[model samples]
Target: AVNLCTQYGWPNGNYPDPYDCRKYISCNGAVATVMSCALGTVFNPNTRNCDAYGNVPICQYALPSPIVVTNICNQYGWGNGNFYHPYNCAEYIGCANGLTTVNACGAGQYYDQALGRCALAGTGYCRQYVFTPPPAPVVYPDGFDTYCSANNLATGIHPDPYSCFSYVECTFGRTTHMPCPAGLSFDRSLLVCDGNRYQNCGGNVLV
Candidate 1:
C-alpha cells in the first residue's frame, strides 16, 4: 500500500495529507522525513501535528466476524457460538449439515455461562451440592443368639469378636440381638449351643 501523500503537487511540493500518517513533507526543501503519531492519534495537516484518532488502549481484540462464527459450532468458552448471543446459557446452538438447532441441558443439569459447559444439578460451576458416603455396618448386642436352627446353626455359627456366641443374626429385615438356649452353652467353633462344654468331637476319622 503506497502511503498517502496524495495530491502529490502540494504548495511547495510538501504533501501532508490531512490523514496521511506517512510524513510531513517539505517539498520546497529536500524529501521530508517520515513521521507518525503515537498510540492515540492521527496526523493533522492544518495543525501539522498528531491528534486523537478517537480510540484508546490501542484497540486489541478484534470483534467476532459473524461469517466465521457461523462456520464454527459449539465453540470454546471464548468463541462466539452459532447462537445469536455467545454468552447465552439457556440454550446452545448446535450446527450440523449446514443447519443450526438450539438445545438445552438435560434433567438435573444447568449450563454454566462462563464455562459454556453443562454441569450436573447441584454440581460444579458455583452450585451447592450435597454428597454423603454409605452408612457403616450394623452391630447388635445379642446379635448371634437366634442363629437359624434349620441348619443346626450351620450358616450363622462363627466367632463373635464382641458377644457370647452371640454377636449378630439376620431376621425379617435386619440383623439384630436375640437370646440363646438355657443350659447349653454356645460353642465358639461349632457356633451351636450344646451339652458338652466343648469338644474335639469324632471326625478324627473313626476307623
Candidate 2:
C-alpha cells in the first residue's frame, strides 16, 4: 500500500501512528492527514504497524475453520487425517463423488506413499500379494517293506520260512501276520514263496 501511494508521487512515507498502527499519518499537502484502519485491525504502538485485532488480546474473536478434502476416491485426504485402501496397499481412496474420477498408477506399476508410483513391489505402496497354492504331494499312505515289497504283484503276501502255511503280507508300511486263502490249512499245505506271488497247498490250488 505504501508503494501504491508512492506511485502517486507523494514524496513522504505514510508514517503509521505509533499510538495506534490502526492509524496512519501523512501529509495531504497543507492539511493534517490522518486515516484510521477499518474494523478488524489495530495499531501496534511498539511496532508502528497495523496488527490484527485478535493479536491485541483485548479484541473478541471466533476463528473460522474446516476443510480437509478427500482425494478422487473420497476415502482419503492429503492432510493429517489419512486413510489407506483396505484391499490393496498400492491403492488409495481415489475419488469422492460416485461420478468423479481418480488417479492412475500404471500397469505393473503401483502407488508408494514414500516415492509415488513405482515399478517395483515394495515400500509402503506394496502390499503382500496373495494367491492359491498348488495342489499335490503327500496324499497317499506311505510304506516300506519287511516281508513284502510295494513292487510285488499288487499284494505282497509271502510265506513263513519256518511255519507251514502261515504268511505275512506287506501293506502300507506295515508287515502283518495273515491267515491263508479260504480253504487252506497250516499242517497239510505247503507254502511256496516268491516276491510276486505266494501260495499254499498244491500247484492246483484253487484261488
Candidate 3:
C-alpha cells in the first residue's frame, strides 16, 4: 500500500478505512499519483487547501517580463530591460502614462531617487541667523547697603570702629565692609558713599 501510494505520489491516499479506503481502492495507482502530485503542486502556500481544481499556481499570475531599453535612466537599479523610460523619451521608448525616466533634470542637480525628482547638489537653503542682545548691567542701592544686603548682613547703622580711617580705608571699608553707618567717613572717588549723609573723606563732593 505504501509503495503503491509512493509510486503514484498519493499523499492523501495514506488515510485508512471507509472514506480513504473507498477512494483509494477505486483510483488506479499511476492516475492517483498524478492527480495527487498535481493537486499538491497547486496547494496554496498561504492556505493548506487540498482543492487543486480551485487553486491557482504561483507561476500562472506572474508579472509579464519587462522590455529592455538602453540609454534610459536606471532609477530602480533595473538596468536596460527594466529601466524607467523618461517622459521625453516616451515617443521613442514607449513608457506608460506618467512614467518618466530617472534624473529627468539635466546636470548641476542630482535626481532624488526616493522622491523621484531633481534636488540641489549641496545642502540647500540658508537658515535664519540670530544676534542676541547682551544682558543689562546690574544696579544696586548704596554701596555699603547693597554690599551688606548681598552678603546677608544684619540691617543697622553700624559705625566704622577703625580709628585710622583714611580715604582709601573709608572707601574700601564702605565698599568691602557690609552695613557701615551713613554718618561714617565716605570716599567720593570709589563711589562707595551711601548718600550725602556720609562725610567725603577724599574732599570730593558726594554725588
Candidate 4:
C-alpha cells in the first residue's frame, strides 16, 4: 500500500497513513490537493488530479488571507453603492453606499398629508377639485289657465257665446247674428235664443 502522507505530503501532519485511494482523490489546486491528500485520496497537487481511486485530496493553503470584499460581499457585506431599501446584506451595503433611491410614489399624484402617501387629485370622499353648479329652475306664469284663455278665445274648453258669434260673423262676412250661440243646444235646425239658454242649430257642431 502507498504511504498516504509521504506520497501526497500532508502538510498539516494530521494523517500519517496512506490515504485510501479507492474512496477520494484530490485534483490540482490550492485547497483540492491538500484537503484530498489529507483525507486519504490520491491528489495531484500540481494538476489537482486524482489517481484511479478517485481520491482528489485538496488543502486550505491560505488560512489568514486579507478581507476581500468581492469574495465575501454576497455572504455578509453590503452592496457597492446606495439603494432605496436593501433587501439583503449585499443590497443594504449598496443602498447605504448611495447606489439607488427609493421610489415609493408614482407619477401624476402627490403625497397626501393625512394618508402619508401618494393620492389622486380629486379622489376624496366628498371633496371635488373642480366646481360645477346645478342648473336653474324653470319659471312659469302664476295663472297659466286664465292667461291663455284671455289671450285666445279658442284656447279654453268652453267659448264665450258673444265671442263665438262675433268670430263666425267676421269669418263668414255676415252682420246678422245667429239665433243661438255656436255651441248652445237647439231643438230645430234654426238657431233661437231661449230666455234661459241659447239653442244650437246643428246636429254635431264644435265650439
Among the numbered candidates, top lDDT falls to 2
The digit string of per-residue lDDT tens for model 2 on 9-100 reads: 23332333323345665534523366775667754321224457644332222322111112222222122212222223334333233322
Supply the TM-score for candidate 4. 0.11
lDDT of 1 at 161: 40
Residue 62, candidate 2: Cα error in Å is 44
Q: Which stretches of candidate 1 lie over 4 Å from their true place?
A: 1-159, 165-167, 171-173, 198-207
Q: Report how far residue 131 has shifted in candidate 4, in Å.
A: 26
The clash count for each model shown is: 6, 9, 3, 47
Ranking by lDDT: 2, 1, 3, 4
List TM-score per model, in order. 0.18, 0.18, 0.15, 0.11
Q: Clashes in model 2: which pairs?
A: 21-43, 22-43, 72-94, 72-95, 72-96, 73-94, 73-95, 74-95, 74-96
Q: Over the full model, what C-alpha lDDT does candidate 3 score relative to the true structure?
A: 0.26
Task: Summarize candidate 4's per-residue lDDT along 1-207 as a digit string, tens digits.
Answer: 233323323221222112332223222221233234333334221122333223122222232421112222233232343211111111111223423333334554433322324444442311110111111121334543343234443321232233212121222221222322211222322332211111221111211
Off by over 4 Å in 2: 1-84, 93-101, 122-207
Task: Give one digit per residue, the lDDT tens place, for model 1 in 1-207.
Answer: 132122221122322332234333343343444554565564332223444543111111132321122322323222223222221223445556445455666665555433545656441221100111111222544534444443243434343444332334544434344323211223456565432211212111110
What is the alpha-carbon RMSD of candidate 3 to the true structure?
39.7
Clashing pairs in 3: 8-33, 68-81, 86-101
